[PDB]
């Protein structure tokens, strides 16, 4: 009890060397599409033509 | 490791007189007394981990706590 008056807990914890997510990042297939100029109209004061 | 300094600034320890008795009371025979003194003479010129661990074993926990509190009071005064 006497040494305990001057004692505090330690913020020590254990974690694995490497931790991975539950779901990995799967690759996404590439699809060719043409240039579209009507994608920024819905944001801001756009103009529809 | 701790080693002694030079040009001491304090000489007021005035320790108590050493007790003297028959050789038997201290390390058995006279021949044994010289060997042990020589063996332990290497620890006189420094203070290190071996001294600290022996202090911990002898003082237990009450000695550590009281020493720590007194040192805190000394720091407060200084």
From Swiss-Prot, chain B:
Assembly behavior: Component of the WAVE1 complex composed of ABI2, CYFIP1 or CYFIP2, BRK1, NCKAP1 and WASF1/WAVE1. Within the complex, a heterodimer containing NCKAP1 and CYFIP1 interacts with a heterotrimer formed by WAVE1, ABI2 and BRK1. Component of the CYFIP1-EIF4E-FMR1 complex which is composed of CYFIP, EIF4E and FMR1. Interacts with FMR1 but does not bind to related proteins FXR1 or FXR2. Interaction with EIF4E stimulates FMR1 binding. Component of the WAVE2 complex composed of ABI1, CYFIP1/SRA1, NCKAP1/NAP1 (NCKAP1l/HEM1 in hematopoietic cells) and WASF2/WAVE2.
Its job: Component of the CYFIP1-EIF4E-FMR1 complex which binds to the mRNA cap and mediates translational repression. In the CYFIP1-EIF4E-FMR1 complex this subunit is an adapter between EIF4E and FMR1. Promotes the translation repression activity of FMR1 in brain probably by mediating its association with EIF4E and mRNA. Regulates formation of membrane ruffles and lamellipodia. Plays a role in axon outgrowth. Binds to F-actin but not to RNA. Part of the WAVE complex that regulates actin filament reorganization via its interaction with the Arp2/3 complex.
Superkingdom of origin organism: Eukaryota
Misc. remarks from the entry: Breakpoint hotspot for the Prader-Willi/Angelman syndromes and may be implicated in autism. Commonly altered in tumors.
Protein's UniProt name: Cytoplasmic FMR1-interacting protein 1
Ranges in coiled-coil conformation: none
Family to which the UniProt record says this protein belongs: Belongs to the CYFIP family.
Species of provenance: Homo sapiens
Protein's cellular compartments: Cytoplasm; Cytoplasm, Perinuclear region; Cell projection, Lamellipodium; Cell projection, Ruffle
Residues of the full protein shown: 863 to 940 of 1253
């Amino acid at each position: 009890r006497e040494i305990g008056i001057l004692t505090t807990n330690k913020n020590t914890s254990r974690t694995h060397k490497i931790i991975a997510p539950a779901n990995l990042e799967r690759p996404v297939r590439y699809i060719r599409k043409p240039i579209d100029y009507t994608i920024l109209d819905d944001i801001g004061h756009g103009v529809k033509v | 490791r701790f080693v002694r300094t030079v040009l001491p600034f304090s000489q007021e320890f005035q320790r108590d007189k050493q007790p003297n008795a028959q050789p038997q009371y201290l390390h058995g025979s006279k021949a044994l007394n010289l060997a042990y003194s020589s063996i332990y003479g290497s620890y006189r010129n420094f203070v290190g981990p071996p001294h600290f661990q022996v202090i911990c074993r002898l003082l237990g926990y009450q000695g550590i706590a009281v020493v720590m509190e007194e040192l805190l009071k000394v720091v407060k005064s200084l």
